[PDB]
Amino acid sequence: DTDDAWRARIAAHRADKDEFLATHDQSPIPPADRGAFDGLRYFDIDASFRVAARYQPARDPEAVELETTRGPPAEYTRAAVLGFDLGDSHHTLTAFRVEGESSLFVPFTDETTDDGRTYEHGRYLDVDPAGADGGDEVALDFNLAYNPFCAYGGSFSCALPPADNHVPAAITAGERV
């Protein structure tokens, strides 16, 4: 519940992910790059990007498809809208339900996408859904934003964020390029 515990949790995740990427046979870092790999690059932790979002579940969960970088569209269900403030501006993102996954999938772009500090196709956030009867407020921590596998140069097919999931602000938290 404390700031120090939150920060330690983020640091532990980042360290553990670096070790997996560096050493595991199932790492998405391509073999050619695994030798020189020295860890992912991140923005420093910034609590201004850990925000409370209003959770607004889709009234009639609808089957939707997102385009992918390779091959056929990915199938998801439109699950919710998440509404949140960054500074003095209000923003919304659509969250998607992925079959067999409990967390919602929130692909997005922002101003760092445009200025080249983060991955050009966008980043991903996983958001754990509120209570099912009937939740309304969830933790949106952009310090946990991460790159699609195709950012690392492998031949993966990754879902592209919808254009509606652009956030007109510089989200200087999470994984960079």
Side-chain angles (χ1 to χ4, degrees), residues 31-82:
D33 297 326
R34 283 182 196 170
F37 182 80
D38 187 23
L40 292 178
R41 294 295 158 253
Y42 291 95
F43 291 102
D44 293 336
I45 294 172
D46 186 342
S48 67
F49 294 103
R50 194 210 216 286
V51 302
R54 297 217 327 163
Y55 178 78
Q56 173 186 323
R59 297 177 305 276
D60 194 28
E62 149 188 46
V64 293
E65 67 183 26
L66 297 177
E67 294 298 333
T68 67
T69 54
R70 215 181 297 257
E75 294 275 333
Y76 301 94
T77 304
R78 184 176 53 85
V81 177
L82 306 171

Coordinates of all heavy atoms in Angstrom, one line a residue, residues 31-82:
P31 N 17.9 -14.1 -31.6 CA 19.2 -14.6 -31.3 C 20.4 -13.7 -31.7 O 21.3 -13.5 -30.9 CB 19.3 -15.9 -32.1 CG 17.8 -16.4 -32.1 CD 17.0 -15.1 -32.2
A32 N 20.3 -13.0 -32.8 CA 21.3 -12.1 -33.3 C 21.5 -10.9 -32.3 O 22.6 -10.4 -32.2 CB 20.9 -11.5 -34.6
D33 N 20.5 -10.6 -31.5 CA 20.6 -9.4 -30.5 C 20.8 -9.9 -29.1 O 21.0 -9.0 -28.2 CB 19.3 -8.6 -30.7 CG 19.2 -8.0 -32.0 OD1 20.2 -7.6 -32.6 OD2 18.0 -7.8 -32.5
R34 N 20.6 -11.1 -28.8 CA 20.7 -11.6 -27.4 C 22.1 -11.5 -26.8 O 22.2 -11.3 -25.6 CB 20.3 -13.1 -27.3 CG 18.8 -13.3 -27.4 CD 18.4 -14.8 -27.3 NE 17.1 -15.0 -27.7 CZ 16.5 -16.2 -27.8 NH1 17.3 -17.3 -27.6 NH2 15.3 -16.4 -28.2
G35 N 23.1 -11.5 -27.6 CA 24.5 -11.3 -27.1 C 24.7 -9.9 -26.5 O 25.3 -9.8 -25.5
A36 N 24.3 -8.9 -27.3 CA 24.5 -7.6 -26.9 C 23.4 -7.0 -26.1 O 23.5 -5.8 -25.6 CB 24.7 -6.7 -28.2
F37 N 22.4 -7.7 -25.8 CA 21.2 -7.2 -25.0 C 21.7 -6.9 -23.6 O 22.3 -7.7 -22.9 CB 20.1 -8.3 -24.9 CG 18.9 -7.9 -24.1 CD1 18.0 -7.1 -24.7 CD2 18.7 -8.4 -22.8 CE1 16.8 -6.7 -23.9 CE2 17.6 -8.0 -22.1 CZ 16.7 -7.2 -22.7
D38 N 21.4 -5.6 -23.2 CA 21.8 -5.1 -21.9 C 20.6 -4.6 -21.1 O 20.8 -3.7 -20.2 CB 22.9 -4.0 -22.1 CG 23.5 -3.5 -20.8 OD1 23.5 -4.3 -19.8 OD2 24.0 -2.4 -20.8
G39 N 19.4 -5.2 -21.3 CA 18.2 -4.8 -20.6 C 17.3 -3.9 -21.4 O 17.8 -3.2 -22.3
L40 N 16.1 -3.8 -21.0 CA 15.1 -2.9 -21.6 C 15.3 -1.5 -21.2 O 15.9 -1.3 -20.1 CB 13.7 -3.4 -21.3 CG 13.2 -4.7 -21.9 CD1 11.8 -5.1 -21.5 CD2 13.4 -4.6 -23.5
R41 N 14.9 -0.5 -22.0 CA 15.0 0.9 -21.6 C 13.7 1.4 -21.0 O 12.7 1.1 -21.7 CB 15.5 1.7 -22.7 CG 16.9 1.4 -23.2 CD 17.9 1.7 -22.1 NE 19.2 1.0 -22.3 CZ 19.6 0.0 -21.5 NH1 18.8 -0.4 -20.5 NH2 20.7 -0.6 -21.7
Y42 N 13.7 2.1 -19.9 CA 12.5 2.6 -19.3 C 12.6 4.0 -19.0 O 13.6 4.6 -18.7 CB 12.3 1.8 -17.9 CG 11.9 0.4 -18.1 CD1 12.9 -0.6 -18.0 CD2 10.6 0.0 -18.3 CE1 12.5 -1.9 -18.2 CE2 10.2 -1.3 -18.5 CZ 11.2 -2.3 -18.4 OH 10.9 -3.6 -18.6
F43 N 11.4 4.7 -18.9 CA 11.3 6.0 -18.2 C 11.4 5.7 -16.7 O 11.0 4.6 -16.2 CB 9.9 6.6 -18.4 CG 9.7 7.1 -19.8 CD1 8.9 6.4 -20.7 CD2 10.2 8.4 -20.2 CE1 8.7 6.9 -22.0 CE2 10.0 8.8 -21.5 CZ 9.2 8.1 -22.4
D44 N 12.0 6.6 -15.9 CA 12.0 6.4 -14.5 C 10.6 6.4 -13.9 O 9.6 6.8 -14.6 CB 12.8 7.6 -13.8 CG 14.3 7.5 -14.1 OD1 14.8 6.4 -14.4 OD2 14.9 8.6 -14.1
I45 N 10.4 5.7 -12.8 CA 9.1 5.6 -12.2 C 8.6 7.0 -11.9 O 9.3 7.9 -11.3 CB 9.1 4.7 -10.9 CG1 9.5 3.3 -11.3 CG2 7.8 4.8 -10.2 CD1 9.8 2.4 -10.0
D46 N 7.3 7.3 -12.2 CA 6.7 8.6 -12.0 C 5.2 8.4 -11.6 O 4.4 7.9 -12.4 CB 6.8 9.3 -13.3 CG 6.3 10.8 -13.2 OD1 5.6 11.1 -12.2 OD2 6.6 11.6 -14.1
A47 N 5.0 8.7 -10.3 CA 3.6 8.5 -9.7 C 2.5 9.4 -10.4 O 1.3 9.1 -10.2 CB 3.7 8.8 -8.2
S48 N 2.9 10.4 -11.1 CA 1.9 11.2 -11.8 C 1.2 10.4 -13.0 O 0.2 10.8 -13.5 CB 2.4 12.5 -12.4 OG 3.4 12.3 -13.4
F49 N 1.8 9.2 -13.3 CA 1.2 8.3 -14.3 C 0.5 7.1 -13.8 O 0.2 6.2 -14.5 CB 2.2 8.0 -15.4 CG 2.6 9.2 -16.2 CD1 3.8 9.8 -16.0 CD2 1.7 9.7 -17.2 CE1 4.2 10.9 -16.7 CE2 2.1 10.9 -17.9 CZ 3.3 11.5 -17.7
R50 N 0.5 7.0 -12.4 CA -0.3 6.0 -11.8 C -1.6 6.7 -11.4 O -1.7 7.5 -10.5 CB 0.4 5.6 -10.5 CG -0.1 4.3 -9.9 CD 0.1 4.3 -8.4 NE 0.4 3.0 -7.8 CZ -0.4 2.0 -7.7 NH1 -1.7 2.1 -8.1 NH2 0.0 0.8 -7.2
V51 N -2.7 6.4 -12.2 CA -3.9 7.1 -12.0 C -5.1 6.2 -11.7 O -5.0 5.0 -11.9 CB -4.2 8.0 -13.2 CG1 -3.1 9.0 -13.5 CG2 -4.5 7.1 -14.4
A52 N -6.1 6.8 -11.1 CA -7.4 6.1 -10.9 C -8.2 6.3 -12.1 O -8.4 7.4 -12.6 CB -8.1 6.6 -9.7
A53 N -8.8 5.2 -12.7 CA -9.6 5.3 -13.9 C -11.0 4.9 -13.5 O -11.2 3.9 -12.8 CB -9.1 4.5 -15.0
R54 N -12.0 5.6 -14.0 CA -13.4 5.2 -13.9 C -13.6 4.0 -14.8 O -13.2 4.1 -16.0 CB -14.4 6.3 -14.4 CG -14.3 7.6 -13.5 CD -15.7 8.2 -13.4 NE -16.5 7.9 -14.6 CZ -17.9 8.0 -14.6 NH1 -18.5 8.3 -13.5 NH2 -18.5 7.8 -15.7
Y55 N -14.2 2.9 -14.3 CA -14.4 1.7 -15.1 C -15.8 1.7 -15.6 O -16.7 1.6 -14.8 CB -14.0 0.5 -14.2 CG -14.3 -0.8 -14.9 CD1 -13.4 -1.3 -15.8 CD2 -15.4 -1.6 -14.6 CE1 -13.6 -2.5 -16.5 CE2 -15.6 -2.8 -15.2 CZ -14.7 -3.3 -16.2 OH -14.9 -4.5 -16.8
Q56 N -16.0 1.6 -16.9 CA -17.3 1.8 -17.5 C -17.5 0.5 -18.4 O -17.0 0.6 -19.6 CB -17.3 3.1 -18.3 CG -18.5 3.4 -19.2 CD -18.3 4.6 -20.0 OE1 -17.7 5.6 -19.5 NE2 -18.7 4.6 -21.2
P57 N -18.0 -0.6 -17.9 CA -18.1 -1.8 -18.7 C -19.0 -1.7 -19.9 O -20.1 -1.0 -19.9 CB -18.7 -2.8 -17.7 CG -19.4 -2.0 -16.6 CD -18.6 -0.7 -16.6
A58 N -18.7 -2.3 -21.0 CA -19.5 -2.3 -22.2 C -20.8 -2.9 -21.9 O -20.9 -4.0 -21.3 CB -18.8 -3.1 -23.3
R59 N -21.9 -2.2 -22.3 CA -23.3 -2.6 -21.9 C -23.6 -3.9 -22.6 O -24.4 -4.7 -22.1 CB -24.3 -1.6 -22.3 CG -24.1 -0.2 -21.6 CD -25.2 0.8 -22.2 NE -25.1 0.9 -23.6 CZ -24.3 1.7 -24.3 NH1 -23.4 2.5 -23.6 NH2 -24.3 1.8 -25.6
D60 N -23.1 -4.1 -23.8 CA -23.3 -5.3 -24.6 C -21.9 -5.6 -25.2 O -21.6 -5.1 -26.3 CB -24.3 -5.0 -25.8 CG -24.8 -6.2 -26.5 OD1 -24.9 -7.3 -25.8 OD2 -25.2 -6.1 -27.6
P61 N -21.2 -6.5 -24.5 CA -19.8 -6.8 -25.0 C -19.9 -7.3 -26.5 O -20.6 -8.3 -26.8 CB -19.4 -7.9 -24.0 CG -20.1 -7.6 -22.7 CD -21.4 -7.0 -23.2
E62 N -19.1 -6.7 -27.3 CA -19.2 -6.8 -28.8 C -17.9 -7.5 -29.3 O -16.8 -7.1 -28.9 CB -19.4 -5.5 -29.4 CG -18.8 -5.3 -30.8 CD -18.9 -3.8 -31.2 OE1 -18.5 -2.9 -30.5 OE2 -19.3 -3.6 -32.4
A63 N -18.0 -8.4 -30.2 CA -16.8 -9.0 -30.8 C -16.2 -8.0 -31.8 O -16.9 -7.4 -32.6 CB -17.2 -10.2 -31.6
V64 N -14.9 -7.7 -31.6 CA -14.2 -6.8 -32.4 C -12.9 -7.4 -32.9 O -12.4 -8.3 -32.4 CB -13.9 -5.5 -31.7 CG1 -15.2 -4.7 -31.3 CG2 -13.1 -5.8 -30.4
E65 N -12.4 -6.8 -34.0 CA -11.1 -7.3 -34.5 C -10.1 -6.1 -34.5 O -10.5 -5.0 -34.9 CB -11.2 -8.0 -35.8 CG -11.6 -7.1 -37.0 CD -11.7 -7.9 -38.3 OE1 -12.0 -9.1 -38.2 OE2 -11.6 -7.3 -39.4
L66 N -8.9 -6.4 -34.1 CA -7.8 -5.4 -34.3 C -6.9 -5.9 -35.4 O -6.6 -7.1 -35.5 CB -7.0 -5.3 -33.0 CG -7.9 -4.8 -31.8 CD1 -7.0 -4.7 -30.5 CD2 -8.4 -3.4 -32.1
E67 N -6.4 -5.0 -36.2 CA -5.4 -5.4 -37.2 C -4.1 -5.9 -36.5 O -3.8 -5.4 -35.4 CB -5.1 -4.2 -38.1 CG -6.3 -3.8 -39.0 CD -6.7 -4.9 -39.9 OE1 -5.9 -5.7 -40.3 OE2 -7.9 -4.9 -40.3
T68 N -3.4 -6.7 -37.2 CA -2.1 -7.2 -36.7 C -1.0 -6.9 -37.7 O -1.2 -6.6 -38.9 CB -2.0 -8.7 -36.3 OG1 -2.2 -9.5 -37.6 CG2 -3.2 -9.1 -35.4
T69 N 0.3 -7.0 -37.2 CA 1.4 -6.6 -38.1 C 1.7 -7.7 -39.1 O 2.4 -7.5 -40.1 CB 2.7 -6.4 -37.2 OG1 2.9 -7.6 -36.4 CG2 2.5 -5.2 -36.4
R70 N 1.2 -8.9 -38.8 CA 1.5 -10.0 -39.7 C 0.3 -11.0 -39.7 O -0.1 -11.5 -38.6 CB 2.8 -10.8 -39.3 CG 3.5 -11.3 -40.5 CD 4.8 -12.1 -40.0 NE 5.7 -11.2 -39.3 CZ 6.9 -10.8 -39.9 NH1 7.2 -11.0 -41.1 NH2 7.7 -10.0 -39.1
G71 N -0.4 -11.2 -40.8 CA -1.5 -12.1 -40.9 C -2.8 -11.5 -40.5 O -3.0 -10.3 -40.5
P72 N -3.8 -12.4 -40.2 CA -5.2 -12.0 -40.0 C -5.4 -11.2 -38.7 O -4.6 -11.3 -37.8 CB -5.9 -13.4 -39.8 CG -4.8 -14.4 -40.2 CD -3.5 -13.8 -39.9
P73 N -6.5 -10.4 -38.7 CA -6.9 -9.6 -37.6 C -7.0 -10.5 -36.3 O -7.4 -11.6 -36.4 CB -8.3 -9.1 -37.9 CG -8.2 -9.0 -39.4 CD -7.4 -10.2 -39.9
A74 N -6.8 -9.9 -35.2 CA -6.9 -10.6 -33.9 C -8.3 -10.4 -33.4 O -8.9 -9.3 -33.5 CB -5.9 -10.0 -32.9
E75 N -8.9 -11.4 -32.8 CA -10.3 -11.3 -32.3 C -10.3 -11.0 -30.8 O -9.6 -11.7 -30.0 CB -11.0 -12.7 -32.6 CG -11.2 -13.0 -34.0 CD -12.4 -12.4 -34.6 OE1 -13.4 -12.1 -33.9 OE2 -12.5 -12.1 -35.9
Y76 N -11.1 -10.0 -30.4 CA -11.2 -9.7 -29.0 C -12.7 -9.4 -28.8 O -13.5 -9.4 -29.7 CB -10.4 -8.5 -28.6 CG -8.9 -8.6 -28.9 CD1 -8.4 -8.1 -30.1 CD2 -8.1 -9.1 -28.0 CE1 -7.0 -8.2 -30.3 CE2 -6.7 -9.3 -28.2 CZ -6.2 -8.8 -29.4 OH -4.9 -8.9 -29.6
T77 N -13.0 -9.1 -27.5 CA -14.3 -8.5 -27.2 C -14.1 -7.1 -26.6 O -13.2 -7.0 -25.7 CB -15.0 -9.4 -26.2 OG1 -15.1 -10.7 -26.7 CG2 -16.4 -8.8 -25.9
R78 N -14.8 -6.1 -27.0 CA -14.8 -4.8 -26.4 C -15.4 -4.9 -25.0 O -16.5 -5.4 -24.8 CB -15.6 -3.8 -27.2 CG -15.5 -2.4 -26.7 CD -16.2 -1.4 -27.6 NE -17.6 -1.8 -27.9 CZ -18.6 -1.5 -27.1 NH1 -18.5 -0.8 -26.0 NH2 -19.9 -1.9 -27.4
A79 N -14.5 -4.6 -24.0 CA -14.9 -5.0 -22.6 C -15.3 -3.7 -21.8 O -16.2 -3.9 -21.0 CB -13.7 -5.7 -22.0
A80 N -14.7 -2.6 -22.0 CA -14.9 -1.4 -21.2 C -14.3 -0.2 -21.7 O -13.4 -0.2 -22.6 CB -14.4 -1.7 -19.8
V81 N -14.7 0.9 -21.2 CA -14.0 2.2 -21.4 C -13.4 2.6 -20.0 O -14.1 2.4 -19.0 CB -15.0 3.3 -21.8 CG1 -14.2 4.7 -21.9 CG2 -15.7 3.0 -23.1
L82 N -12.2 3.0 -20.1 CA -11.5 3.5 -18.9 C -11.3 5.0 -19.0 O -10.8 5.4 -20.0 CB -10.1 2.9 -18.8 CG -10.2 1.3 -18.9 CD1 -8.7 0.8 -19.0 CD2 -10.9 0.8 -17.6

